A paper describes a structure:
Deoxyuridine triphosphate nucleotidohydrolase (dUTPase; EC 3.6.1.23) is an important enzyme that prevents uracil misincorporation during de novo DNA synthesis. It catalyzes the hydrolysis of dUTP to deoxyuridine monophosphate (dUMP) and inorganic pyrophosphate, thereby maintaining an appropriate level of dUTP with respect to deoxythymidine triphosphate (dTTP) levels. Homo-trimeric dUTPases have three active sites, each of which consists of five conserved motifs. We found that Arabidopsis dUTPase contains a unique tryptophan at the 93rd position, which is located between motifs 2 and 3.
When the active sites of both the apo and holo forms are superimposed, all of the apo active sites have three water molecules at similar locations as those commonly found in the holo form. These data suggest that the coordination of these water molecules is necessary for initial ligand binding at the active site. In the apo form, all of the tryptophan 93 side-chain coordinates were oriented upwards; thus, all of the tryptophan 93 Nε1 atoms were located away from the serine 89 Oγ. These are likely due to crystal-packing induced hydrophobic interactions with proline 46 in neighboring subunits.
Residue numbers in the entry:
A (entry chain C): 26 to 152
B (entry chain B): 25 to 154
C (entry chain A): 26 to 156
The structure:
Amino acid sequence: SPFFKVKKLSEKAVIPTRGSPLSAGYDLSSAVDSKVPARGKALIPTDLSIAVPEGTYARIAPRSGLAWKHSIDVGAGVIDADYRGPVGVILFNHSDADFEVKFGDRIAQLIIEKIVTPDVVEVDDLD
Amino acid sequence: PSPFFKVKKLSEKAVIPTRGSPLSAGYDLSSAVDSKVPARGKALIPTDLSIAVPEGTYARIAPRSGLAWKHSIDVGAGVIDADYRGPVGVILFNHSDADFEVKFGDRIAQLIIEKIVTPDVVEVDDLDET
Amino acid sequence: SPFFKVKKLSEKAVIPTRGSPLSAGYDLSSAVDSKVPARGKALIPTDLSIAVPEGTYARIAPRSGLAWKHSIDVGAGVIDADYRGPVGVILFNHSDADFEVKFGDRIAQLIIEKIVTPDVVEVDDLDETVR
Ligand SMILES: [Mg+2]
């Protein structure tokens, strides 16, 4: 049975919520105030640790508003189901304008994507 | 219930998205406009479509491989919720020093209906060790 | 039942491996020495061809380390389940420093994501949603 368990690592953390009833993702909020330099990057802590089920992973996905309005998008973003460290969001600034993330800003959305993980079979012929 | 992909044309310029091979992941998205993605910049390209995909999925607007190598084009963000009924636009980022020209009808992205789970969020005191 | 078939196209190829029992991705290694130029791009060969099952595709996904240490992101990355050509990794460099790729370096990770591929139908109107 699917689950999404979240542990607050500080009092500043915001428990993720979905934005609409059928929404794909859980909104993630910044636990800090941080500059994202023009044509540069920032690593934004959520002060959360998580667990998601085997047969899935948590993808840190971009919010469309951040991307369209501010040319900000998300690098990396693959959180394994057994990763128990703090969840941070890597933002890339694809513009010549400096940007600033404020404490509590929603900076990404977490999507729990279904996957398969079979053992690899090496072959001489794929078909 | 069986999966579905319904599309509604918002103008005559919209093109029904079509897959590219019988096992292909995604449905090709065509531009409804003439436009451009400026060098080192971005654009929102209308498809003039509204869509519906099933609960337990979302529609991901994903980059085409050819455009990524030839024009350094990427999709800046492409999460479309299963309950999103607004117009579908494609956000393109141009990671090169030359403009990318868009003519109406041009394929600019592909849509992939990804399976997900959406359980309730549960705050906990401790997580298991791995 | 899911599978992941891999064919090596040369001796330089490395069978993709998963790091831990619950890891999402299979690490992909470069088959070449190469460079991703500052603010530029490169197509890095793996010298692999692959097959994944119907109802999935293989997503070429970024490694977190390369993203943060080198501003490297993966472009493109949608590998169809019936694509039988060579698998190359498209890297974008979002920094002003060249990124060197050495033979055997891990440059991405492959994730076999579950999808649906229903027959698309045009309709006159869609349901409006409480949103
Ligand atoms: Mg995905």
